[PDB]
Amino acid sequence: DTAKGVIPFSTSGATWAVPRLSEDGITSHFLRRRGYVTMTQGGSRDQNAAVRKILSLIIAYDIQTQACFFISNEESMRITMAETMGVKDRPNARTNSWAEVSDSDINRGIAKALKEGNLTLDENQKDGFMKLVHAFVADILAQSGHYKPVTSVTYFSAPIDMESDYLDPFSIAIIRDVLDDSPFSELRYDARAMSELEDRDVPITRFSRVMAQMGNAMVRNIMVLNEAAQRKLRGLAVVGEIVHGRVRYLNDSFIQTLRSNINFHLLTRTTPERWAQSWIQAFGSLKGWVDAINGIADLSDLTPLIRDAATSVEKFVTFAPLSFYQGLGSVTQIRALDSSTNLAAVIVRYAAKEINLIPAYQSFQVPTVDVGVKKTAIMDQRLSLQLPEFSEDQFFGMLEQRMQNMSDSEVAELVDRIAKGETPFGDVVKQLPGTSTLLVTNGYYMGGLLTNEDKIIPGDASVPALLYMQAASFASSVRFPPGEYPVFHHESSNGDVRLTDQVSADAQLSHSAVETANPLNFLVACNVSVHTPSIAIDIIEPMPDLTRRGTTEYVHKGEIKVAAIPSLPPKSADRKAQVSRETAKFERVLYKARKGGAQVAAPIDLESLFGIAVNLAVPTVKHVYSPDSKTKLALDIIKGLESDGDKAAATRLLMTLARAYTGTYSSLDEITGIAAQPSDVAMQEFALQSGVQTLKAVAKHTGIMEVATIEMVEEKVRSLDDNRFYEIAAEVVLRALK
Amino acid sequence: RRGTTEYVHKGEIKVAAIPSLPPKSADRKAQVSRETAKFERVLYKARKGGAQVAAPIDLESLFGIAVNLAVPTVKHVYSPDSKTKLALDIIKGLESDGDKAAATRLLMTLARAYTGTYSSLDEITGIAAQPSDVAMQEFALQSG
Numbered sequence: 001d002t003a004k005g006v007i008p009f010s011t012s013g014a015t016w017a018v019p020r021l022s023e024d025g026i027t028s029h030f031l032r033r034r035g036y037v038t039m040t041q042g043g044s045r046d047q048n049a050a051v052r053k054i055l056s057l058i059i060a061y062d063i064q065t066q067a068c069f070f071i072s073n074e075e076s077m078r079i080t081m082a083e084t085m086g087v088k089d090r091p092n093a094r095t096n097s098w099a100e101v102s103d104s105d106i107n108r109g110i111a112k113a114l115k116e117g118n119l120t121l122d123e124n125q126k127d128g129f130m131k132l133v134h135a136f137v138a139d140i141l142a143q144s145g146h147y148k149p150v151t152s153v154t155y156f157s158a159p160i161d162m163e164s165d166y167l168d169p170f171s172i173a174i175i176r177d178v179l180d181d182s183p184f185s186e187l188r189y190d191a192r193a194m195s196e197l198e199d200r201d202v203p204i205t206r207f208s209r210v211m212a213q214m215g216n217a218m219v220r221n222i223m224v225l226n227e228a229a230q231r232k233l234r235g236l237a238v239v240g241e242i243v244h245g246r247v248r249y250l251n252d253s254f255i256q257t258l259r260s261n262i263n264f265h266l267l268t269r270t271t272p273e274r275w276a277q278s279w280i281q282a283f284g285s286l287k288g289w290v291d292a293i294n295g296i297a298d299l300s301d302l303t304p305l306i307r308d309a310a311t312s313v314e315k316f317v318t319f320a321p322l323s324f325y326q327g328l329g330s331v332t333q334i335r336a337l338d339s340s341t342n343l344a345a346v347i348v349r350y351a352a353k354e355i356n357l358i359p360a361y362q363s364f365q366v367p368t369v370d371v372g373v374k375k376t377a378i379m380d381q382r383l384s385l386q387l388p389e390f391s392e393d394q395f396f397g398m399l400e401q402r403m404q405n406m407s408d409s410e411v412a413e414l415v416d417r418i419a420k421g422e423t424p425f426g427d428v429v430k431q432l433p434g435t436s437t438l439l440v441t442n443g444y445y446m447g448g449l450l451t452n453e454d455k456i457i458p459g460d461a462s463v464p465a466l467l468y469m470q471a472a473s474f475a476s477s478v479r480f481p482p483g484e485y486p487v488f489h490h491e492s493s494n495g496d497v498r499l500t501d502q503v504s505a506d507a508q509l510s511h512s513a514v515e516t517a518n519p520l521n522f523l524v525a526c527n528v529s530v531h532t533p534s535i536a537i538d539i540i541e542p543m544p545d546l547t548r549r550g551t552t553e554y555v556h557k558g559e560i561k562v563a564a565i566p567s568l569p570p571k572s573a574d575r576k577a578q579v580s581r582e583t584a585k586f587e588r589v590l591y592k593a594r595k596g597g598a599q600v601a602a603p604i605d606l607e608s609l610f611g612i613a614v615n616l617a618v619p620t621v622k623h624v625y626s627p628d629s630k631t632k633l634a635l636d637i638i639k640g641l642e643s644d645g646d647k648a649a650a651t652r653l654l655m656t657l658a659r660a661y662t663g664t665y666s667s668l669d670e671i672t673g674i675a676a677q678p679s680d681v682a683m684q685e686f687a688l689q690s691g692v693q694t695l696k697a698v699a700k701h702t703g704i705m706e707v708a709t710i711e712m713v714e715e716k717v718r719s720l721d722d723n724r725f726y727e728i729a730a731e732v733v734l735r736a737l738k
Numbered sequence: 739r740r741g742t743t744e745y746v747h748k749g750e751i752k753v754a755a756i757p758s759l760p761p762k763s764a765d766r767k768a769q770v771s772r773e774t775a776k777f778e779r780v781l782y783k784a785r786k787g788g789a790q791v792a793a794p795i796d797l798e799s800l801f802g803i804a805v806n807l808a809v810p811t812v813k814h815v816y817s818p819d820s821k822t823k824l825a826l827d828i829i830k831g832l833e834s835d836g837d838k839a840a841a842t843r844l845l846m847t848l849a850r851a852y853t854g855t856y857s858s859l860d861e862i863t864g865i866a867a868q869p870s871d872v873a874m875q876e877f878a879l880q881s882g
Contacts, residue, residue, distance in 0.1 A: 227804050234803065246763065276761045282803035283796035283860070284777075285761025292796070292860025298869070299799055299859055 001479075006245035010515060011260040011478020012489035015319035016469045019162055019169050025540045026057060027160040031447055031466070032537060035622040036156040036559050038544055041134070042103040043152035045142035052135035055128075056185040058157060061175075063128040065222050066121075068183060070133060071215030076113045078208035080137065084109035085146075087204055095207070097200030100148040106137045131157070132184055139187055140211055144197050152552050156544070156559060166453065166465050168267055170236060171274060173316035174309070178229040183218035190214075230278040232312055235305035237275035237286060240268025244482040247290055248297035254310045257319055260478040262456065262468070262486050269483060322472010322488065322519045327534025328352075329470045333523060334400060338408040341498040345403035345411075346432060346523045347396060348467065350443035352537030352624040358385045358704055360610075361546065363562055363617035366553055373557055378549040378617050383610065385618065385704055386695075387627050390660035392442070395637050398649035399428075399440060402641065412436060414644075424644070426636030434461035435524050436502040441467075445633045446625040447537065457518045458485050458506065471519035474528055485517045496527035543619040561703045563616040565606045573671070579603050580674055587697035589673070591689040593682055594722050602673035602690065604697045609668060618702040627705040631657070635712060651721065658688075658717045659728055661710065665698065666691030667736040684729040691732060692717075754807040756797045764862070770794050771865055780864070782880040784873055793864035793881065800859060822848070849879075857882030 001009040019029045028034035037058065040051050056064075070076055075089075082089035084105050110133050114126070121129060141147045165172050193210040196202065241247055243259050258264045276286040283289040292299065318324070330349035336342060360383040366375040406414070415438055418424070419431050427444035434457055443449035443466070454462030472478075475488040493512040502524045503509060507516035514526055522528055544559050554560060566586040568575055578584035579601045587604040610616050634657050641650035666687055676682050696710045717725075745751060757777040759766055769775035770792045778795040801807050825848050832841035857878055867873050 223804075231803065271763070278761075278803070280758050280761035280798075282798040283761075284759025284798045285763075285766055287761070287763030288759040288766040288794055288796055288860055288863060289799065290763055290860065291766070291863030292799075295861025295864065298861055 002251050005248070006243070006482060008481035008484075008487070009477065009479035010487035010489040011480075012476025012491060014260045014262055014322045014472045014475060014478035014486045014488055014519075015257065016322065016465070016472065017169055017261055017263045017317045018320050018325075018469070019172075020316050020318045021535075023538070023540045026054060027162055029162045030164070030166055031449055032539065032624065033163065033447070033622060034159040034541075035620070036544060037159050038541070039155050039157050041153045041155060042138070042149035044149065045139065045145075045147060047152065048135055048138050048142075048149075052132075052139065053185050055131055055135060055157075056182050057176075057179050058160060059128040059132065061179075061222075061226070063125050064132060064182065064184060065226075066119075066125065067129045067132040067136075068215055068218040068222055070117070070119075070129070071136060072212060072219045073215070074208045074212040076117050077211045077215070078204060079113035079116060080106075080109040080133070081207045081211070082109075082204050083112045084137070084141075085204070089204065091203075091205050093204045094201055095204055097146075097198075097202070099146055101141055101146045102148065102150040103134065103138060103153075104150065106134055106141070110134060110137065128157075136184070136187065137211075140214070143189060143194055154548070154552050154554055156556070167263060169317050170264070170267075170313055171233065174229055174232045174236070174312050176316060177312040178225050178232075182225060183221035187214065188217070230281070231305070232309045233275045234278040234282065235309035236313075237271060237279065238302065238305060239309070240264065241271055241290070243268060243480070246271075247293050250303070252303070252306055254306055254313075257323055259480045260486065261319060262322070262472070265480060265486060266455065320469045320473060322469050322475050322478075324473065325466075325470055325534065326473045326530060327470065328537065329466075329530060330533045331470075331523065331528055331530045332400070333525070333527075333529055334403050336406060336408040336411055337404070341525070342408065342500040342502060343437060343498070343525055344406045344408070345400075345429075345438055345440050347400065347403075347440040348442070348470070349396060349533060350441070350446065350449050350466075350537070351533050352447065353539060354623060354625045354627075354630070355542060355621050356387055356389050358387070358543070358618060358621055359383070360385050360616040360618045360702065361549070362611060362614040364615070365562065368555075373555050374562070375553050375555050376560060376562060376617055377553050378546045378560070382614060383616065385698060385702060386664040387704065388631060388660045389664070390630075390634065390657055392630065392633070394656060395634055395653055396440070396442075398641060398646065398653055399425075399637060402644075402646055402649065403440065411438070414438065425640030426633075428633060428637055429640065431461075432520055432523070433457065433463040433467070434459060434504045434518050435520055437524055439467075439523075442633070445629050449537075457520075459504070459518075463520070468519055471522050474522045474526070475519060487515065487517050488519050488522070490514045490522050490526055492526065498525035498527075500525045537624055539622065539624055542623065543621050546617075546619065558703075559620055561618050561620060563606075563610060563618070563701050565610060565615070565701055567607060568603055568605055575603050576672055576674060579672065587694075587700065589686070589690045589693040591685070591693070593676075593685055594718070594725055595679070595681055595685065598675045600673065600675065600686065600689070602686070603669070604690070604694050605669065606697060606701060609694075609698070616702055618704070620703055628709045631709050631713060635716060638716070651724070654716060654720055655724060655728060657713065658720065659731065661695060661713055661717075662688045662691035662728065662732055663735070664691065665694040666732050668694065681726055681729070684733045685725065687732045687736065688717075688725070688729045750811055752809050752811060754797075754801060754809070756801060756806070758798060759794055759796055766794050767863055767865060770863065780877070780881045782876070784867075784876055786870070786872055786876065789866045791864065791866065791877065791880070793877070794860070795881070796860065853879045853882035855882065 001007050026037055040047055079089045082093060084101055085095040085099055087093045087095055110130060138147050162172060196206055197210065239255055239258055271286060279286045279289050328350050332347045333343050334345045336344045359381050361378045362380050362382050363376045363378045366377055368375050415431055415436060429438055429440050432439040441450055449466055450464035452462040452464050456468050457463045472488055474490060476491045477489050479487040491513055495511060497511045499509055503521050504516060504518050507514065507521050514522060568586050579588055582601060589602040589604060591600050593600060634653060638650050638654050673686055692714055696707055699705045699710060700707050759777050770779055773792060780793040780795060782791050784791060825844060829841050829845050864877055
């Protein structure tokens with residue numbers, strides 16, 4: 001709606017802007033995290049140019065631009081060259097044409113000119129800056145060329161942080177576009193000058209000079225980017241407040257998709273300084289310009305600024321169903337025993353790829369002096385370490401049933417019970433935010449998909465983003481009042497709509513019309529369900545790629561872990577002498593037979609599992625859904641079924657869960673396991689208990705998962721029925737024999 | 739030559755020291771009225787009786803957004819200043835010995851030329867005023 005100025009409406013499908021999902025392996029968004037971007041120094045001129053590009057996009061302006069002013073300053077560059085080659089930074093100082101420069105030489109040169117440079121840098125600046133100026137000098141001095149890299153070295157720098165900025169991915173998108181065309185991506189050379197450098201016997205003065213002018217052009221290059229960025233922002237701070245109507249007849253294709261964008265609308269309400277900054281140069285301030293096009297409506301042709309902004313915003317920001325995205329969310333509604341016309345639970349299952357198993361490689365360790373880091377030389381894959389491997393399907397299965405057999409009043413009780421802070425199921429089941437039904441999500445528990453930001457819905461209930469969005473994406477049109485929340489409308493005929501008491505106070509409701517400022521209401525109770533979820537959440541390079549590994553050495557803080565296995569004493573029975581002690585010094589199985597009931601103690605020999613003289617190097621997986629936050633799901637579902645009482649269900653899930661934890665390392669030295677006798681169970685009990693306790697000891701010495709969460713289970717499995725212990729233990733000796 | 743060389747100049751080229759407006763709906767309006775503040779303005783006193791007008795001049799949006807106009811100094815033969823100073827001396831000398839008819843026509847011509855060029859080149863900002871049809875078209879001269 002756009003009669004004669006601006007006025008309210010309510011698109012039933014409003015859209016919030018999310019980050020356009022990339023597979024680029026250089027960023028981390030709030031649903032997808034990236035630990036480390038893998039990187040490289042030296043090797044060859046081309047390898048350094050691949051990196052110089054990725055560095056072009058990772059490191060932010062203030063570090064990048066700072067480096068360009070460093071390069072533009074001759075007196076600084078004279079010193080980095082003068083020191084790179086063994087000579088003084090003086091007008092009469094000569095370097096040869098046969099001199100070959102290792103990257104080692106460049107860096108200690110740059111370092112020396114930072115040091116005398118007398119400019120103050122953060123630890124972060126100093127690090128990013130040293131990598132740009134290195135990648136620039138190793139390209140000049142390849143073109144020169146005196147570069148002759150002694151080797152390739154791999155470091156890991158960290159990705160672009162879009163972990164916050166749920167609310168504003170627009171200024172992130174602008175900046176990130178403009179970085180593509182950044183002065184560090186491709187260096188433009190002067191061939192005439194470069195010939196002077198190829199020449200022997202060159203004075204060092206001729207080297208600084210040409211690098212200076214190259215920099216001096218990069219500085220201009222940036223002044224142009226810092227302009228074409230602030231031109232785009234100018235355009236965004238024009239869309240608001242034409243959208244709120246402090247300025248005046250345009251319903252552009254862009255402006256339209258942003259008038260029904262909850263994100264934009266909030267950010268723009270009172271005008272954002274970050275975007276109004278850009279008008280201080282042109283007119284200044286924004287209010288000076290705003291008065292201009294309100295004198296005019298009573299320095300025009302405004303439609304390219306908006307178009308400029310768009311191409312950027314568009315290529316980095318997809319707008320979402322409160323349309324797409326109608327996932328990634330398995331929405332299955334479930335109604336009380338009082339079938340119609342009101343429901344109890346709304347299940348929302350976000351899925352993503354996990355990793356079932358992790359490869360492990362024999363490594364040796366290479367000296368450096370830092371503690372600090374370690375260099376390691378990963379050689380051969382020699383195992384693949386196993387995880388739990390339990391399907392999250394069945395757990396929500398027993399939970400569906402439970403919520404169906406929930407009567408109408410039973411439910412509204414559990415809700416109040418929960419709304420008072422009680423959390424019977426953990427964060428699996430919560431109050432549906434601002435509605436009187438409850439929801440049953442996966443993703444409070446995974447990737448932190450759901451976390452609650454509290455301005456989106458009117459009123460007092462804070463609400464997770466990817467619901468508000470997945471719900472609003474089921475809305476047919478969307479009304480946009482200046483200075484208020486978006487009001488949504490859903491119109492889908494005819495009978496597939498319920499008239500219910502559960503919806504928040506603001507909601508109008510008929511059969512096939514729903515009109516509320518709180519989208520989740522469209523699950524109370526419009527017939528809205530999605531069998532399987534739209535978009536599985538993906539990780540590119542979840543593990544650091546040791547695919548190069550025959551040819552390069554690696555440097556890692558935490559991203560690779562090396563195994564500090566304790567070695568057993570080699571002795572028929574000197575093992576047995578320390579195993580029983582119940583306080584000695586290599587990993588063991590330590591259970592207390594539930595068949596009454598002496599203490600068992602058996603040594604765990606990681607030696608013979610991992611290989612004989614081998615220090616497993618094991619990558620750390622940056623998971624989306626981590627064994628620890630999954631197992632911690634199941635256990636919270638089991639606990640919450642344990643009351644309100646479904647012993648039948650709860651005790652079946654705990655069984656499933658158990659089978660998975662004990663299965664993997666069972667079975668993998670008779671006379672050693674003590675105390676025991678040739679019982680047929682006491683023995684098949686060992687089979688369970690070593691199967692978890694060796695998985696535990698493996699997860700201790702290789703950072704696969706927290707030991708914490710294995711003991712969390714071990715405990716819930718001691719408390720498992722004595723009759724069941726031995727059903728699963730039969731199952732595990734029968735699997736083991738084959 | 740300018741794409742290929744740098745320039746060195748005492749006076750022959752001048753670079754613009756524009757004052758930047760404050761970027762604010764109406765923090766502009768708060769300093770414009772003061773009749774003593776710090777960016778260029780239109781400052782006339784309506785000959786239609788007759789409050790003081792004060793409106794900010796935004797060289798920013800005329801010259802370009804982040805741009806420092808370098809402007810060559812023209813070595814003229816007949817310079818606007820020694821021409822306009824002709825016309826004004828002719829107008830004054832016609833004003834007596836009396837030709838009001840002539841003198842007041844020339845002054846009109848002269849005026850049209852001075853006001854024409856930058857007219858018109860931010861409604862709510864120009865203060866004090868009301869939607870008069872002249873008070874407004876007076877601004878048009880006076881800002882020009």
